[PDB]
């Protein structure tokens, strides 16, 4: 990883596009950098950049422009794009740009840009809210599954003001459905107790989520300790039909909208990949 190199030449961006919370073109919403501008070596010094080790820094404050009224949080995030800046292909829909999971219909397997899928990402949480109401305080969202309009994966990191320690774990949302949450190291309660097991801030780790057909497993991979692993069977679940197509996010979603405008998430990711089939 090198620090004289932008985040595109240092990772594989080839397809994901930038979602960053700032409004230049003046349609009220977050702005995209696409994928054929990001790989040219974007960066801005505020929200995206590379760090002075060559990690990739997603920095997002409370305050900004969200990328649809449907939402209440910043993000500075990547979006999974298949189509690998071929524009040609729309960026919603079972389609060359996004995935299903191998449960869907063969229809859905062949029109889309891949079957199944594995996000895998090394990172640090170097900040997280220390602002704002006792139930948000805390949180960012480092990995997603994101489906039509409902998510498959979001993967929490958390830490509370008084811990010197942080938590780790996962929603999953059937389609049209309701989260149903495990926790996978300490708790996401706004009342736990400060986790002995839990991360700290700067404290390196990796997780890998994978889809096989109908079941997700998401793994907490930490140097000197065991992997943790949670699988949740998404049989249930609805996305193993024609209509419904998949993308990988990555990056910081600030779970937090009533902090401090300046208070802010930050994390630095040291490796990053996205894989199908």
Known sequence: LDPQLPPSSN??????????????????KADSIKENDLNAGYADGTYFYTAADGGMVFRCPIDGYKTSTNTS????????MLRRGDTSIATQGVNGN???????????????????????????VNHVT??????????VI???????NDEPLRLYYRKLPGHSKGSVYIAHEPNGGSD???????????????????????????????????????????????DVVQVVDMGNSGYDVADQ?????????????????????????YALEQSHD
């Open 180 to 226: 149903s949450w495990y926790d996978m190291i300490g708790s996401r309660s706004s009342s736990a107790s400060d986790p002995s097991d839990g991360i700290a801030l700067d404290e390196v780790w990796s997780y890998e989520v994978k889809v096989v057909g109908n079941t997700l497993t998401v793994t907490i991979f930490r140097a000197g300790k065991d």
């Open 11 to 28: 990772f594989d961006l080839s397809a994901w596009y930038l979602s960053v919370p700032t409004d230049n073109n003046g349609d009220g």
């Open 245 to 269: 197509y998949q993308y990988f996010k990555a990056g910081v979603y600030n779970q937090n909208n009533t902090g401090n405008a300046s208070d802010y998430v930050q994390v630095t990711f």
């Open 130 to 139: 220390t602002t704002g109401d006792s139930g948000q305080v805390g949180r």
């Open 98 to 124: 996004n995935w299903v999971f191998g449960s869907a219909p063969a229809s859905a397997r062949e029109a889309a840009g891949g079957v199944d899928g594995v996000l895998r990402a090394t990172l640090a």
């Open 73 to 80: 949080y910043t993000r500075t995030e990547l979006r999974e």
């Open 142 to 148: 480092v990995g997603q599954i994101h489906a039509n």
